[PDB]
Amino acid sequence: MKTAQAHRRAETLIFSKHAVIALRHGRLCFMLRVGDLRKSMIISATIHMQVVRKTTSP
Amino acid sequence: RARFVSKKGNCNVAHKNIREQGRFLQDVFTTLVDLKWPHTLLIFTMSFLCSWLLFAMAWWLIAFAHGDLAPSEGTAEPCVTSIHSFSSAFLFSIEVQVTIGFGGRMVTEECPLAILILIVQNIVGLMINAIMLGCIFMKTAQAHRRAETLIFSKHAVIALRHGRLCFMLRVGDLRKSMIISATIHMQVVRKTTSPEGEVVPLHQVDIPMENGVGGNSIFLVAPLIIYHVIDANSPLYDLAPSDLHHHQDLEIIVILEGVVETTGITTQARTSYLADEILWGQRFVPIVAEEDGRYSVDYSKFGNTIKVPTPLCTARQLDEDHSLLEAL
Amino acid sequence: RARFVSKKGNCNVAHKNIREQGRFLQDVFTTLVDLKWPHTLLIFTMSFLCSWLLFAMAWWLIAFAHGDLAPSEGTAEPCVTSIHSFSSAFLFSIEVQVTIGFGGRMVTEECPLAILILIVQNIVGLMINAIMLGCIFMKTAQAHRRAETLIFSKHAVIALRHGRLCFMLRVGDLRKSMIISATIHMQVVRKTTSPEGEVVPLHQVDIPMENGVGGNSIFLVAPLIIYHVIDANSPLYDLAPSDLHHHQDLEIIVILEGVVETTGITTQARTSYLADEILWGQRFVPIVAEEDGRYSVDYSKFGNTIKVPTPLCTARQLDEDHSLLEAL
Amino acid sequence: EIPWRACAKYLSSAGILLLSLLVFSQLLKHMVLVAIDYWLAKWTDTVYAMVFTVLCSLGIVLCLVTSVTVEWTGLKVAKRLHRSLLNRIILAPMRFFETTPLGSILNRFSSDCNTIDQHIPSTLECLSRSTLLCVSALAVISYVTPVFLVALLPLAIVCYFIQKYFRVASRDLQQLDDTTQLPLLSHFAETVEGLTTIRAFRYEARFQQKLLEYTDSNNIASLFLTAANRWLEVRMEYIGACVVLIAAVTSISNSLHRELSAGLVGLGLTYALMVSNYLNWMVRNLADMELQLGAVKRIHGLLKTEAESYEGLLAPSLIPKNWPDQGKIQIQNLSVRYDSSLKPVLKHVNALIAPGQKIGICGRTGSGKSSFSLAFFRMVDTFEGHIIIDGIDIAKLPLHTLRSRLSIILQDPVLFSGTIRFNLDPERKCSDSTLWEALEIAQLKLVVKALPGGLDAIITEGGENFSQGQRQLFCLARAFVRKTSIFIMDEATASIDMATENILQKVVMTAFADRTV
Amino acid sequence: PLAFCGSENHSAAYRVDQGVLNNGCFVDALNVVPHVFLLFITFPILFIGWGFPGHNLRWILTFMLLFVLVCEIAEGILSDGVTESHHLHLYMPAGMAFMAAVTSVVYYHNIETSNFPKLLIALLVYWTLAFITKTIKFVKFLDHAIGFSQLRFCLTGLLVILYGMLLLVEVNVIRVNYQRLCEAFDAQVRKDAIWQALSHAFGRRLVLSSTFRILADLLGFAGPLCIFGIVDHLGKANAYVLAVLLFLALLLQRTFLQASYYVAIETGINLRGAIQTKIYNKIMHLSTSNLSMGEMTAGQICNLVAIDTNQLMWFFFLCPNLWAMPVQIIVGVILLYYILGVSALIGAAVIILLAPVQYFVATKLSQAQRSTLEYSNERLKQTNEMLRGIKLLKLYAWENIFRTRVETTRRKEMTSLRAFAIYTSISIFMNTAIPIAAVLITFVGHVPSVAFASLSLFHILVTPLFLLSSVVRSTVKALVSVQKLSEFLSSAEIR
Ligand SMILES: Nc1ncnc2c1ncn2[C@@H]1O[C@H](COP(=O)(O)OP(=O)(O)OP(=O)(O)O)[C@@H](O)[C@H]1O
Ligand SMILES: Nc1ncnc2c1ncn2[C@@H]1O[C@H](COP(=O)(O)OP(=O)(O)OP(=O)(O)O)[C@@H](O)[C@H]1O
Ligand SMILES: Nc1ncnc2c1ncn2[C@@H]1O[C@H](COP(=O)(O)OP(=O)(O)O)[C@@H](O)[C@H]1O
Ligand SMILES: [Mg+2]
């Protein structure tokens, strides 16, 4: 169970240290870069972007 | 011309200038477990042989240092009984680490260091055996060719269906086993230029496939036709005949992802179609037929197509001319 | 009539003329691990027996070649001590490869080739043992019948619900274990003809099931009713009584996909309903009832249905006549 | 495979206590005969004599129980097979018969069950004792010389391969035998059935030449069969002879240079001789039992029949005894079809029928009117609409009463081989006065008075004793003995002359003024 | 015991080494190794599924190899008749090679014809190794061994070259009427009951095949003579010649049996043809008022040309034994009184009493069979008519009535058939149980080769009894059959 683990495959998936916001198709869009370092493929790659803040209900 | 994906699913990408590396020797562990059978076998055999020789040099050297090889006085008792050559010490090492231990070659209490070497060799043998077992298991529990029994057509076509222009290709499974949760992602790749200036070299856009739900779930038993309806939203809505050719910046990647029926692993197959493999105005010859209480699927003429007369303008111009004809 | 899927989920498909084959003997490896228990056991036993006899012939033959069986002079020392028949060499082989090694039958340094055979047999024994362990583990870690404890009704019905015509069938789980991420795909199969000319022999269309979200997630504890609302978009929107019968080109495939609770493997069950098993104007007798602080589910009369008066025209004609009645 | 499943169905048609008796009695008898003469060879080099006699008695009583076992199990298998086959094929719907040729379904009750019940027990005991004596002699020749094993293990494989080759040839060869033998019997039937037209046409020579050609062809086929059998038997017998030589010389060498006995020498050579004698019988009997079990599998497959649905969704206590009243009939939307793949020959038909002693249906042929007649007895699928007989639907009654309480007269007259009483009275509950009445009202009694027996003369072979007219008359007669207030006729005037036609019509309409025709 | 080549303390040096390949035993066993290699390396990879250049050339080479393997097994078993230690190195390698070649062919056509090629490297290596070992044996067999039995040298070189041809094949595939006329003439000559003409035109072939059968079972019956000779010669180089003579006797025996049986079956087929022809002719001349009024039905008319003809065909298959067996039994008595039963064979009196019991079984079975066949014809016409027109039985709803009516006839027929089965079981048991009675009686009546030769001969004599058990059945059946024929061939004839 220990040596069958990669456990660093989560460390070969990198993101950009910064994020930008620019124009695309006339609309304002938030952007960032993501890349894989290993030559292996990732299966069923899925992304969830999720904003977090202290909101106040109406 | 630098195809992004090879027909077999190989990514012809060059990953230059990767700054950080060298995490730990579990990466080379996986390199081991993902390797050719004869060379993996050779690595295991040399692992055992090197272990045996290392501890064999050890036993021989200790017995020699106990002043036991020479005298044979009788009144003295060896670290280990009855070893009289490195050959003897080597056989002893095999008998120990393999846990055979015939008995003619036995450890005696006279040498604490010998007991230490025994402890060390037992630990090393157990750990190395466990490593070999984990490797061989992780290796032979793999299909690793289930991605090679999932075939696609060597070409793709575009034809008419329900009056709309649709992109089509064939996919089929060769093994009689089922694929679990079969999912398709078609994705167009090109060098696009933003209406605001920027350019994206290998920009990718997920072109949705057509399905009754609109999802991506397919049920691959007979080789079927994956097709996309070219709506106005489709990136190919501005595609035309005589534009597609080997020197045209355009590619379509098809990605099949599904869990293998037996093992809970998830295989993936990739294929690509660029502007020369995409035939126009053809439809795949149906290879499915009714047989004596069955469905014969002739996998010969699998990707075989046939020409069908079709308009020679863009889906954009299709919709324009169709509205021009239907406005009266 | 060549049912596409058998009631138990068997695909009655003939895969003729498969050009490429013969990848490697890991395919037959999987064939091994996916096999009947007595024959798998027999294969393991014959693997060990053949190993033992092969190396036993080896030891016997070497001892014979050392000129050790005949002389018994005493001044000479055998390759291996105290073997005097192929029976002895065979017991020696067992003692070695099984790592028992009593001790009366011991290797001596006098024969380098004997040490070589020892090394070879140890490697072969370790590798064959690891293979047997991986096989037996991959084999007994499988449920392989979890797809047989997921049942469907032998028939399907079509009735009225919220004034709309809906296709229905029952599904239930027999084990008390839970299924994880239960997902349903209903898929109509027929020989369709394109409005542009082409024909598709076993054309498939994913008929979406009805659910609160519209997704495909179900939570199968009590045997529930999978149903599809026959909208105008449904392929069955042009279906009628007296059209469904054993000689009608129409089939409905139901596919349940879900992760087994214990093991992270994903099981799949298939079933089919063709135009004779699809009852009309009936509703399943509710088998769920309240009991003394529980819900008794009588799995008898599981697929038991009851006739209910319903219109005898197509959902198309349903909507037409309903608009005809509601327009005033 | 095929033999496994066929023989398993065969034996499963018998009990399991029978298979126990059979198998274990065979093992015991043969093994004990082997043991007794082995121990006799031991008796070569006294209470021994007493126990020898008691072993002989054991052998004889075991053989007795074997024989009775075989006979009684053959009996039971045959009885069960025939009875179930009859009760199941008779249950089939009309589609089975109208679709499957009657000769094909008849061949089973004719020859196949005959083949079973007087050929399978014999071949069974034959190959049973053959194979088991063979295997026993084999075990013993292996024991009396441990060297023979390394010659036998080859011999079994040689046997296996070549007999498999022979059987794979023989399957096709027997298929050819059947496809050559069927035209024979088909020609005999098509000759007996149309002899009058043949002798009229005078083309006797042509058909004699046709049958001569068929006969020559079937004889050539049987000759090929025979040649193949000779080939394989010669092969296997030379095999057995080589085995004898091996075992014999081996035992010789052994004993006269490493003594064991003379008796066991004899045992070896004698069981070698026995193998040589009984191996071919084992194989030939195996071929014969394979043929017969193929026939058994044929009957078992025919047994896989279609249901009848005689159980009607109603309560037999709710339907009154004198159920059919004056006989109102409301049919509507009666869309009908023969099978699911057929077209709705009669569709969207409604008609309300009060009583009134008669109605009428006419029209050209192919109009699907005999079909409209069949709709009263649910023979047609009637997939839409329904009929209502004065109170209740038809698709809820048990077909038995549904077809017992309503009469019919078919177009083609179908009669029975027997006396007149049986043709009119299947059950023996009808006073003969009613019989004479039903004959006179159909204008038959005047013919019967000239007939010596008097409702007693035999009708032969479905009716080959009178005119098609007279056959149709008898049909009407037996259809009249019923007290039904309604019934239907399907063109029961095609064989009637105009005078008898009008007379019969007036008489039946006067006699049935309350009944609905 | 169980030595590979060890006989004495002199053979306790039959494994010493002044050069291993000089030791014939060593090369002999090294021949064994590659065979076991292939055998136990191809077992599992075969059970997994069981649980082309020169393809036909491969078949032919394989058959030649199987041939010479069997021959070598025979030679090796023979070569251990002089020594008293069973030194089996002579033939164990041969049988191992045999099993290995069989496994080889099996594995081949079970892998490449079915699953996939490019695994045949195993078979390749096996052919290489076997070729190497046999070349070694041949080379060291050229000079060292005396090569007295030159057949050894010949088979050795043969196997060498044959393994060579196999290895070649492997690397190559790795690179990628008249009778009826006489019957009618005989019927006319007899008439101016059929058996008369039948025999008068047809019996020469019958008695000819029966003559072959008589000569055959006589020659075969001359085998316990061989047995008695074997044993009383072994009691105190003549036994080999005599066992070979037994083998030759069996060969001639069975080659005469095949001739007799083939002639008999030819006769039966010709007879079936002629009788079918005559029946069809009579049909062509037949009247219709008879088929309509009096007796016959198309059903049973075709039923006879089927079953009657089959019965006669099988009976004239099985009849030449019915004539040859009496010679066998009388020569049995003669030869018992001449050998080892020179007096006091009282057990044969039971066989004397057997024949009348068998004839009584015959006539009682005939009494059963008459009723069996009449009720069979009854049930047969019943079901015929019941299935001819079934729409009536369905509509008029008389299924139960006719079903039970047919069941009555079926039950009567079943009673007759039960009596028949009782009688045939009586016959079978009497037949199988008189020989053990006979041997018991003749053996206990005394109060080493004598009683045993009796045992063997009485088995030989009980062999034909086992067939006579059903011969008499077919006999009664053909009796009733010809009765039916004589009944049918006497009907009306429209001029
Ligand atoms: N060439 C590279 N090879 C491997 N990993 C990299 C590389 N460049 C960036 N990363 C990873 O991406 C993450 C975020 O990247 P970041 O934008 O910080 O790169 P950076 O500091 O600008 O380096 P550079 O100037 O080389 O792009 C970092 O944590 C780093 O580990
Ligand atoms: N009959 C088949 N059996 C196995 N694999 C096949 C078969 N047909 C096609 N494939 C696979 O599909 C891929 C694309 O097939 P492609 O369309 O090139 O076949 P093709 O050139 O049409 O050959 P053919 O005309 O014989 O069908 C190939 O790489 C091949 O591996
Ligand atoms: N057993 C059958 N199977 C299939 N079709 C049938 C059968 N019997 C009748 N038909 C069809 O029904 C039509 C007429 O039916 P029917 O009423 O029996 O004859 P008619 O109309 O002459 O009285 C015909 O065209 C025929 O094709
Ligand atoms: Mg009609």
Numbering used by the authors:
A (entry chain B): 169 to 226
B (entry chain C), C (entry chain D): 32 to 359
D (entry chain H): 994 to 1038, 1061 to 1532
E (entry chain H): 2 to 52, 68 to 192, 262 to 277, 286 to 329, 353 to 563, 573 to 620
Report text from the authors:
A broad and rich body of literature based on decades of study describes the biochemical and functional properties of KATP channels (Aguilar-Bryan and Bryan, 1999; Aguilar-Bryan et al., 1998; Ashcroft et al., 2017; Ashcroft and Ashcroft, 1992; Hibino et al., 2010; Nichols, 2016; 2006). These channels were found to be large oligomeric complexes composed of four sulphonylurea receptor (SUR) subunits, which belong to the ABCC family of ABC transporters, and four Kir6 subunits, which are members of the inward rectifier potassium channel family. The focus of this study is the human KATP channel composed of SUR1 and Kir6.2, which are found in pancreatic beta cells where they play a major role in regulating insulin secretion. By virtue of their sensitivity to both ATP and ADP, these channels are thought to couple cellular metabolism to membrane excitability. Three naturally occurring ligands control the activity of KATP channels: PIP2 is required for activity, ATP inhibits activity, and ADP potentiates activity.
In the quatrefoil form, KATP is a symmetrical tetramer; each protomer consists of one K+ channel subunit and one ABC transporter. The TMD0s are bound to the channel and hold the four ABC transporters akin to the leaves of a quatrefoil. Upon further classification and refinement, the propeller form was determined to 5.6 Å resolution and the quatrefoil form was determined to 3.9 Å resolution. EM density of the entire complex is very well defined, but residues 193–261, known as the L0-loop, containing a conserved lasso motif is not visible. Mg2+-ATP is bound in the ‘closed’ catalytically inactive degenerate site and Mg2+-ADP is bound in the ‘open’ catalytically competent consensus ATPase site. In this structure, both the inner helix gate and the G-loop gates are closed. Four ATP molecules are associated with the Kir6.2 channel (one ATP per subunit); each binds in a shallow pocket on the surface of the CTD. Formation of the quatrefoil form is associated with disruption of the lasso extension/ATP-binding site interface. In the quatrefoil form, the SUR1 transport modules reside coplanar, that is, in the same hydrophobic plane as defined by the Kir6 and TMD0 elements. In the quatrefoil form, we observe a new interface formed between SUR1 and the Kir6.2 CTD near the ADP-binding site.
